[PDB]
Design a protein around this ligand. Structure first.
Ligand SMILES: CCCCCCCCCCCCCCCCCC(=O)OC[C@H](COP(=O)([O-])OCC[N+](C)(C)C)OC(=O)CCCCCCCCCCCCCCCCC
Ligand SMILES: CCCCCCCCCCCCCCCCCC(=O)OC[C@H](COP(=O)([O-])OCC[N+](C)(C)C)OC(=O)CCCCCCCCCCCCCCCCC
Ligand SMILES: CCCCCCCCCCCCCCCCCC(=O)OC[C@H](COP(=O)(O)OCCN)OC(=O)CCCCCCCCCCCCCCCCC
Ligand SMILES: CCCCCCCCCCCCCCCCCC(=O)OC[C@H](COP(=O)(O)OCCN)OC(=O)CCCCCCCCCCCCCCCCC
Ligand SMILES: CCCCCCCCCCCCCCCCCC(=O)OC[C@H](COP(=O)(O)OCCN)OC(=O)CCCCCCCCCCCCCCCCC
Ligand SMILES: CCCCCCCCCCCCCCCCCC(=O)OC[C@H](COP(=O)(O)OCCN)OC(=O)CCCCCCCCCCCCCCCCC
Ligand SMILES: CCCCCCCCCCCCCCCCCC(=O)OC[C@H](COP(=O)(O)OCCN)OC(=O)CCCCCCCCCCCCCCCCC
Ligand SMILES: CCCCCCCCCCCCCCCCCC(=O)OC[C@H](COP(=O)(O)OCCN)OC(=O)CCCCCCCCCCCCCCCCC
Lengths: 347, 48, 115, 80, 171, 140, 98, 175, 318, 105
């Protein structure tokens, strides 16, 4: 790939995201969604293998269908409203179609099937760009229309995606599929609280982005994509094993690490409104997520798996990778819990 | 040549629009009366 | 109303000549007259095989340039505006972006046919 | 830069002519003084109805008749 | 809701200016120049109160004025006007530029007989001022009372009472 | 799927076993239809007959679960003369779990389903008594 | 509302059920996608022209422009798919199942 | 009957949509979408916007011919199921046509149907307007005002199309 | 009395199509040092009649391997599209006055290709599919440049109405301020009508008879008169665009005879182009309208957008 | 994250399109410009909750201007009763609804 073309495409992806984020029009929201999708398609086709074609085709079909539902909801709102402003929807049919469109864009169950396959079929950097950047514009639009979403539909989607992601994360040995199922569970966690307090959703978004970015940078730096490939890091760099240990401990919501702060504030916010069964169920499925995190950290950090003979040849060479912002992001992903009242800046 | 003819055509267009503007009030009065008469005819037959 | 009458008149003029071209003359139809014509010899395979196309990129950019000229057709009405400088700038910028896309395809050998 | 111009006119004159025409079309409305006349011609075309304003008493600029002297006239459109 | 209001058919009856569109188009500039006052009064009222049921007597007055202008035209220059509107009416698009000779003939006959000068270019599109005696309608849109707005935030910003007040955090 | 629950819950408990049995069988049938439709969509059957047989087996199993659950709960509330009690629903849940074990032809699934569905049915009666909200509307 | 709205949304629902149930041909699903965008175009311009929203007349041109852009993207992805395997069948995209 | 002209055009619209949404063969799907685009242009032309109908007709005809070239290159087989050659295609075509005619009979009898919205029974000539448009066409003036009002729309559309050319050229690269 | 008007439009155009086949055969005789048909009648005036009667008493010959529905549908579509092509043409009054006639010609030009494509596809032949894909490539080559040439020319007219094109050049011919646009328009309509040197569809050398290599008589005649009606009306379209004549509203026959003479001379030049040049390749044509016509047309469109602003010569839209 | 940049910077990108009562080319009014004006001015600065509680009349009247449900409902009632009266034989249409009445202008 030409780096000039790659830079232009990345700036166009960012431009589509801010065009969604700053516009006061539904058609401009839709234009930003289309330009984001059509500019992120070739990033997923960087290596030109058949798996990238499969991932790009499935992602294209899912985002296309979601955009059609988005446009239908917009047009029905235009019919029943005569205006275009990004606010609550003036029709329950439009609200339901918009909610399913944004759920299909977010990879929420039962529209969750494409996410592990698309994440697996593309390189690690493109997967990071997907799972972090692409999951902001649907969250922004969901933040805009919270007076109009049906509570039963969004809570059904949230608990369904939490349960399905936590269950599906137990049967994976590839790291990208694990990360996709974890992403599904985290979007369930964020959108279960959106109708109660959206500041909690923004805080959860920021912490999840930081945590999954730290882990994807760790996997890129070690150049491992399977768990048996991750298990060689103790013979390569033990400090990276310590880093993945503490980040996997934080990702399961284990205190006193910063990943427990979002779930704690979700439970705190949802019990002001007398909902007690739901946060308990979300806590138990978070325990399932912590289980497959524990399996991973048993594989990579707390045991010494057998290594090979060419690891000596890898010992003789020091790493020259561009681990951009890895220590800062690891520190933010681990020890941000005594600074919890910082969350008020998102109000 | 096209510049000369286009400017002349714009002058003629402005003259036609001025004629239409001068004709507007009479047509508006007749349109208002016809619409009100047709609405009254429809209302008077609606009772029957 | 007159356009549908004209279209129907043209259609029943067209379908009258075909219907009198199928029933009038004497027919001698055999299982050799209707064989596919392959310059006198039997064909070697079907005619529904994948006929591969080399100008796919030019067809895709034909779609994009057809939409570019679809955006460009309101220009005679848009010249009747009051904000004339902004209209002139946006028309020039759209056409310049079209030319930039064409030049980028030209410099990258996109218009050259495969194989 | 003269040798390059001679070479490109010797090889592909169509691209040279197109670049010259496009450059002319870009840079000519900046320097030409007749564009303001086109602006005023477009402004002075009466598509709508010129609705009149209520005479409160203090408005001597607006006329009371179409043949009154005050108001925007179109003599320049006749002369040009 | 409410029963909609409508004037009776005796209030809508009027003598009609029964001429073709070519008669109106031929004498459009003279009609615009001569009868500006009732036409502009009717236009001002019709644009002001946005109601055709309250704008009926002015339509009656504009019909009488247009009919009076045409009856004055018929008395003096019936034959040049007849030839002029015939030459207008032959054209498919009713072009003004195809009958400049009848324009000059009609203009000369009207100017010498009655003394009417045609408007120049751009004059009939001028915006004028109308002095009338009707009161200004206070509520043309029939808007109801607007809701009370929210109270405005006021006062100096004191520091937060006992800090964050979030679980155990003392600041 | 809302009016079916409101059709079930409006009858006073331990009064008419037949209407409660029909209502709970309707709940079971709806659950079986949605489960079977998802099953044939996500897992393709071998042929047409296999698909309709699987769909019918699923909805009959869930309809049996609902029918004997409602019958057992209403009979228990009628015999005990204590209608607003989670014990009746505990016996109903265990009878349903035994029915699921008979449908699957295994005793371990039957015992586990008895225990867990009895606990969930008792908790459902407690929530109906005390007005516990799962999809609680926002308050603050 | 009007019954022309009934037929337009009913056509949209037909093409939606067409897109969501595949027939082992990706290009037919692409055609169904263009049918859905055509239905959106027709519905939008019907309401826009009926309610005399004159400034919104520029919208459906932009919507159809982005429709064709995403159609071109779909065709390019289909060229890549048909260059990998023998045909364009949607059952060949099952590598990401393990 | 002639007052129901847009109704008849919309019934041909839905007939073409269910003809090509059965997915028989992309050649016949192309024919069906050509029919649907032409009659949709007709519908929006009786609603007044002739320019919009002509543009959608022209754009869809160009796209349909290019995709016809594509399926003659890529999506074709030995014996294409054009129609009636497959059981499920004929079944779903008949099912869609029967459902459409069923609801047409229903709305032409009760003069009101309730599928999720509520649709009236008369023609759509009632919802027209009794006024005149003067000396301009509203749709042409709106898309003319695209240049003088919508500079941001022009910028985002042109940028999206230019990077779309870049995207499709860097997709079909092979390595 | 509209049906009489429609009949008196649609009958003389096909009569003139037959006599254009006569005149084309005579000119294509006389340029190549020989004669045309002069044996059947007095100077061969009865040759189109004999050809027409012959083609309608020959065998229809629907192939067995061909899909019969599209095979019959395609020539009907071709003839109907060529016949409805002529409707808004002002001579000096069109049959149907239309606000947007130019876009109607463009849309029907897009639609008329599909008859060629479906006649190639339905007849189960390799040569027919080759001709169909060559037609596809030809259309994606010419259509963009055709539409943008016509757009950049109509900017001096003010509207898409064809009757306004008579008034807009009543002082001077429109071939003077758009002579390069006139030449590229002429080349683009040479490519549109599948005539030499841009035949590339009914090639009798690269193929045997192109997309109609299986079409026997009768149905084949539909394509023949469709193509000849297309070339006549396309020359008429060029004559209206660039060579407008003097129009008197009292005597329309002056405009009719001036217009008819100009369009006949244009068709004579069309057959003159036919008998002078070798046929292009079907990829050399694609490198012609894209690498040579499109950049100059974009530049000319910039020029013809800026120029009415430049000279305050914006034409009226009414 | 509605990072509103347009009011912070002072530019407008899609504000001129978002409502039916904005500035139009030579002031072409919409069908329900007045109803949109009334509903907009009713519910400015009071929030969405007070908008749906304290401007229900204006909003529902504007929505009836948009889709016209009740207008065609009343017309359907009148049409159906007139057809039943015609078929039964208790009504005869007047001559001015039959095709000629020497029309007004
Ligand atoms: C636009 C130009 C064309 C316009 C349309 C066509 C104009 C001319 C129409 C008349 C053409 C001639 C008659 C029809 C065609 C006959 C062809 C033929 O060979 O027929 C042989 C056949 C006779 O053939 P046969 O009966 O000996 O059988 C031959 C086949 N075997 C031997 C194998 C059994 O003629 C007919 O069938 C009669 C046709 C009608 C004759 C006239 C009837 C009255 C008309 C008044
Ligand atoms: C209808 C009215 C009359 C119409 C005119 C035409 C009638 C006569 C037709 C003659 C026979 C044509 C038969 C078909 C020919 C097809 C081939 C063909 O034409 O190819 C096009 C050929 C192609 O040339 P080529 O094929 O040699 O291309 C060579 C390409 N390379 C180098 C890459 C190998 O020419 C063009 O593309 C030119 C198009 C017209 C340009 C007009 C320019 C006008 C002047 C501009 C200004 C110049 C001054 C300098 C700048 C000043 C700035 C202020
Ligand atoms: C600022 C003006 C307005 C600009 C925006 C509007 C532009 C309108 C025209 C659009 C043209 C689109 C296509 C451009 C393609 C350029 C790249 C290209 O393909 O160059 C190839 C050509 C040499 O040909 P070759 O290498 O053989 O090509 C392969 C087969 N032909 O390479 C060449 O012939 C050289 C191409 C580059 C140099 C051109 C120089 C032209 C100079 C004209 C006079 C000065 C004009 C003032 C402006 C400055 C322009 C640089
Ligand atoms: C072995 C593994 C390791 C150890 C695990 C933990 C074991 C100890 C924890 C569980 C102990 C049993 C639950 C507590 C018993 C005391 C309270 C109670 O639930 O009583 C049952 C209740 C008694 O009747 P009543 O008088 O109505 O109760 C008053 C309170 N409402 O009964 C009824 O009203 C009728 C029956 C109702 C449903 C009972 C079952 C569900 C609720 C309890 C669980
Ligand atoms: C009762 C009965 O039949 O249990 C046997 C059953 C397993 O039967 P199976 O092996 O399937 O034949 O066993 C089961 O279904 C599971 C065991 C029955 C329930 C046992 C409950 C008490 C367990 C120990 C608790 C200690 C405290
Ligand atoms: C371990 C898991 C423990 C789950 C505990 C759930 C406790 C019950 C909460 C839901 C419930 O049943 O609420 C009762 C409610 C009827 O109660 P009431 O408020 O009187 O009726 C008016 C309806 N709003 O009922 C309803 O509103 C409808 C019925 C809801 C049933 C939800 C549970 C179904 C079975 C499990 C799936
Ligand atoms: C309610 C939801 C369903 C609405 C339609 C119901 C009737 C049509 C479906 C009948 C059942 C068969 C079926 O679903 O086939 C799926 C078919 C692809 O199946 P295939 O892989 O070709 O073959 C396996 C089947 N033997 O794929 C298709 O048939 C896809 C095309 C469907 C087009 C539907 C158009 C009609 C209107 C539907 C309502 C709107
Ligand atoms: C199976 C294969 C297909 C078999 C069937 C083939 C049928 C014939 C196909 C060719 C004809 C397709 C026509 C498509 C629509 C064309 C619209 C058109 O020509 O519009 C021109 C004109 C525009 O009017 P305007 O410029 O606004 O001026 C009027 C103001 N006084 O408009 C007017 O002047 C208005 C005149 C009345 C318009 C009525 C509405 C359109 C009627 C469409 C009928 C159905 C067409 C189906 C086409 C199918 C194509 C595959």
């Amino acid at each position: 790939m030409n780096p000039i073309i790659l830079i232009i495409i990345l700036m166009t992806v960012m431009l589509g995201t801010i065009i969604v984020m700053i516009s006061t029009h539904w058609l401009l929201i839709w234009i930003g969604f289309e330009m984001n999708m059509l500019a992120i398609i070739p990033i997923m086709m960087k290596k030109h293998n058949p798996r990238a074609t499969e991932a790009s085709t499935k992602y294209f079909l899912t985002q296309s269908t979601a955009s059609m539902l988005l446009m239908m909801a917009i047009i029905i709102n235009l019919m029943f409203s005569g205006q275009w402003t990004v606010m609550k929807l003036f029709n329950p049919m439009a609200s339901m179609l918009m909610t399913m469109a944004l759920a299909m864009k977010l990879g929420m169950a039962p529209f969750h099937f494409w996410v592990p396959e698309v994440t697996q079929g593309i390189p690690l950097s493109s997967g990071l760009i997907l799972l972090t950047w692409q999951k902001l514009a649907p969250m922004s639009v969901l933040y805009q229309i919270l007076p109009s979403i049906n509570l039963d539909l969004i809570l059904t989607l949230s608990i369904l995606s939490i349960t399905i992601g936590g269950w599906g994360g137990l049967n994976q040995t590839q790291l990208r599929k694990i990360m996709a199922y974890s992403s599904i569970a985290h979007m369930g966690w964020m959108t279960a609280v959106l109708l109660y307090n959206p500041t909690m959703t923004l805080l959860n978004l920021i912490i999840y982005i930081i945590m999954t970015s730290t882990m994807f940078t760790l996997f890129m730096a070690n150049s491992t994509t399977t768990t048996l490939s991750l298990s060689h890091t103790w013979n390569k760099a033990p400090i990276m094993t310590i880093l993945v240990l503490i980040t996997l401990l934080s990702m399961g919501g284990l205190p006193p690490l910063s990943g427990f702060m979002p779930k704690w504030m979700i439970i705190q916010e949802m019990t002001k409104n007398d909902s007690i069964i739901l946060p308990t169920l979300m806590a138990i499925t978070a325990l399932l997520n912590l289980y497959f995190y524990m399996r991973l950290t048993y594989s990579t950090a707390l045991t010494m798996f057998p290594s090979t003979n060419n690891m000596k040849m890898k010992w003789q060479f020091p790493t020259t990778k561009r681990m951009t912002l890895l220590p800062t992001m690891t520190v933010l992903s681990t020890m941000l819990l005594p600074l919890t009242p910082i969350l008020s800046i998102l109000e | 040549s096209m510049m000369r003819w286009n400017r002349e055509r714009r002058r003629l267009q402005i003259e036609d629009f001025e004629a239409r503007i001068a004709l507007m009030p009479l047509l508006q009065a007749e349109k208002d009366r016809r619409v009100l008469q047709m609405l009254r005819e429809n209302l008077e037959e609606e009772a029957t | 109303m007159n356009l549908m009458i004209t279209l129907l008149t043209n259609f029943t003029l067209a379908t009258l000549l075909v219907t009198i071209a199928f029933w009038l003359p004497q027919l001698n139809v055999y299982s050799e007259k209707t064989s596919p014509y392959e310059c006198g010899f039997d064909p070697m395979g079907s005619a529904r095989l994948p006929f591969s196309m080399k100008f796919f990129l030019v067809a895709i950019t034909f779609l994009l340039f057809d939409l570019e000229i679809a955006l460009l057709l309101p220009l005679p009405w848009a010249s009747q505006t009051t904000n004339l400088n902004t209209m002139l700038t946006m028309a020039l910028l759209l056409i310049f972006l079209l030319a930039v896309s064409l030049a980028y395809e030209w410099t990258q050998k996109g218009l050259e046919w495969t194989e | 830069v003269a040798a390059f111009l001679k070479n490109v006119w010797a090889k592909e004159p169509v691209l040279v002519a197109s670049f010259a025409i496009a450059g002319l079309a870009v840079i000519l409305p900046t320097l030409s003084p007749y564009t303001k006349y086109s602006l005023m011609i477009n402004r002075a075309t009466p598509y709508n109805y010129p609705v009149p304003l209520r005479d409160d008493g203090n408005m001597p600029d607006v006329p009371s008749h179409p043949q009154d002297p005050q108001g925007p006239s179109l003599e320049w459109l006749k002369r040009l | 809701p409410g029963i909609v209001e409508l004037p009776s058919l005796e209030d809508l009856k009027v003598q009609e200016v029964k001429v073709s569109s070519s008669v109106l188009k031929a004498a459009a500039h003279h009609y615009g120049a001569q009868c500006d006052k009732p036409n502009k009064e009717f236009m001002l009222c019709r644009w002001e109160e946005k109601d055709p049921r309250r704008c009926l007597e002015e339509g009656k007055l504009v019909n009488q004025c247009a009919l009076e202008f045409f009856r004055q035209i018929k008395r003096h220059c019936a034959e040049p006007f007849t030839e002029y509107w015939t030459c207008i009416d032959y054209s498919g698009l009713q072009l003004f530029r195809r009958c400049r000779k009848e324009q000059a003939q009609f203009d000369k006959c009207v100017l010498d007989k009655l003394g009417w000068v045609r408007p120049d270019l751009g004059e009939l599109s001028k915006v004028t001022k109308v002095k009338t005696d009707r009161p200004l309608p206070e509520n043309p849109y029939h808007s109801r009372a607007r809701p009370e707005p929210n109270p405005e935030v006021e006062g100096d910003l004191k520091p937060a009472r006992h800090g964050s007040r979030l679980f155990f955090w003392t600041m | 799927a809302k009016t079916l629950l409101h059709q079930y819950w409006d009858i006073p408990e331990g009064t008419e076993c037949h209407r409660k049995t029909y209502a709970a069988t309707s709940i079971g049938g709806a659950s079986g239809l949605v489960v079977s439709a998802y099953s044939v969509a996500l897992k393709t059957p071998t042929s047409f007959l296999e698909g309709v047989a699987r769909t019918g087996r699923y909805t009959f199993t869930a309809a049996a679960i609902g029918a004997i659950f409602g019958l057992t709960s209403c009979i228990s509330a009628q015999v005990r003369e204590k209608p607003d009690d989670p014990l009746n629903y505990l016996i109903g849940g265990c009878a349903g779990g035994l029915t699921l074990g008979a449908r699957t032809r295994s005793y371990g699934i039957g015992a586990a389903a008895c225990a867990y569905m009895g606990l969930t049915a008792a908790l459902v009666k407690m929530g109906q008594l005390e007005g516990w909200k799962v999809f609680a509307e926002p308050k603050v | 509302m009007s019954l022309v709205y009934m037929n337009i949304m009913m056509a949209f629902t037909v093409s939606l059920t067409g897109l969501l149930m595949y027939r082992s041909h990706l290009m037919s699903s692409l055609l169904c996608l263009e049918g859905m965008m055509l239905s959106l175009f027709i519905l939008a311009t019907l309401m826009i022209l009926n309610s005399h929203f004159t400034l919104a007349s520029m919208m459906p041109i932009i919507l159809l422009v982005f429709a064709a852009c995403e159609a071109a993207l779909g065709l390019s992805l289909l060229v890549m798919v048909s260059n990998t395997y023998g045909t364009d069948y949607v059952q060949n995209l099952n590598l990401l199942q393990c | 009957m002639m007052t129901y002209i847009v109704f008849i055009l919309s019934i041909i619209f839905v007939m073409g949509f269910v003809g090509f949404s059965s997915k028989p063969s992309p050649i016949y799907g192309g024919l069906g979408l050509i029919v649907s685009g032409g009659v949709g242009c007709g519908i929006v032309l009786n609603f007044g916007g002739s320019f919009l109908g002509l543009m959608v007709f022209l754009i869809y005809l160009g796209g349909m011919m290019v995709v016809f070239g594509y399926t003659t290159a890529m999506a074709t087989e030995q014996y294409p199921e054009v129609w009636v050659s497959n059981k499920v295609v004929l079944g779903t075509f008949i099912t869609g046509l029967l459902m459409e005619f069923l609801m047409v009979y229903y709305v032409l009898k009760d003069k009101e149907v309730e599928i999720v919205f509520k649709f009236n029974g008369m023609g759509d000539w009632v919802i027209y307007d009794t006024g005149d448009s003067g000396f301009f066409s509203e749709e042409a003036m709106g898309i003319a005002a695209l240049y003088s009002y919508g500079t941001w729309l022009v910028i985002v559309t042109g940028w999206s199309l230019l990077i779309g050319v870049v995207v499709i050229m860097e997709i079909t690269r092979g390595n | 009395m509209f049906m009489i008007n429609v009949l008196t439009l649609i009958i003389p155009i096909l009569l003139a199509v037959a006599f254009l086949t006569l005149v084309e055969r005579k000119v294509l005789g006389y340029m190549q040092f020989r004669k045309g048909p002069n044996v059947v009648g007095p100077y061969g005036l009865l040759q189109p009649i004999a050809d027409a009667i012959k083609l309608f008493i020959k065998e229809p010959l629907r192939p067995a391997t061909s899909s019969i529905s599209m095979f019959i549908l395609a020539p009907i579509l071709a003839l109907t599209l060529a016949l409805t092509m002529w409707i808004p043409l002002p001579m000096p009054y069109p049959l149907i006055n239309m606000n947007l006639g130019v876009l109607f010609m463009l849309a029907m030009s897009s639609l008329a290709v599909y008859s060629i494509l479906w006649s190639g596809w339905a007849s189960n032949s390799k040569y027919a599919l080759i001709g169909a894909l060559r037609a596809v490539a030809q259309t994606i080559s010419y259509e963009v440049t055709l539409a943008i040439i016509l757009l950049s020319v109509l900017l001096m007219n003010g509207s898409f109405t064809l009757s306004t094109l008579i008034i807009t050049q009543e002082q001077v011919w429109l071939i003077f301020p758009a002579w390069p646009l006139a030449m590229m328009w002429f080349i683009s309509t040479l490519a549109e009508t599948n005539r030499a040197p841009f035949d590339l569809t009914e090639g009798e050398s690269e193929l045997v008879s192109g997309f109609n290599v299986e079409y026997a008589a009768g149905p084949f005649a539909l394509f023949f008169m469709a193509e000849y009606a297309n070339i006549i009306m396309m020359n008429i379209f060029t004559t209206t665009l660039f060579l407008g004549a003097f129009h008197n509203p009292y005597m329309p026959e002056l405009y009719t005879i001036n217009f008819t003479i100009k369009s006949l001379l244009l068709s004579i030049t069309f057959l003159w182009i036919r008998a002078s040049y070798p046929r292009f390749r079907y990829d050399q044509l694609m490198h012609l309208l894209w690498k040579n016509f499109l950049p100059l047309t974009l530049a000319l469109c910039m020029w013809h957008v800026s120029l009415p602003i430049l000279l305050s010569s914006i034409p009226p839209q009414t | 994250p509605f990072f509103d940049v347009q009011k912070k910077l002072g530019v407008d990108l899609d504000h001129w399109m978002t409502i039916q009562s904005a500035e139009q080319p030579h002031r072409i009014p919409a069908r329900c410009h007045a109803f949109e004006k009334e509903w907009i001015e009713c519910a400015h600065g009071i929030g969405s909750i007070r908008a749906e509680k304290e401007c229900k009349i204006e909003f529902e009247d504007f929505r009836e201007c948009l889709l016209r449900q009740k207008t065609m409902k009343r017309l359907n009632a009148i049409k159906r009763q007139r057809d039943k009266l015609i078929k039964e034989g208790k009504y005869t249409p007047p001559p001015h609804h039959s095709g000629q009445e020497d029309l007004r202008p």
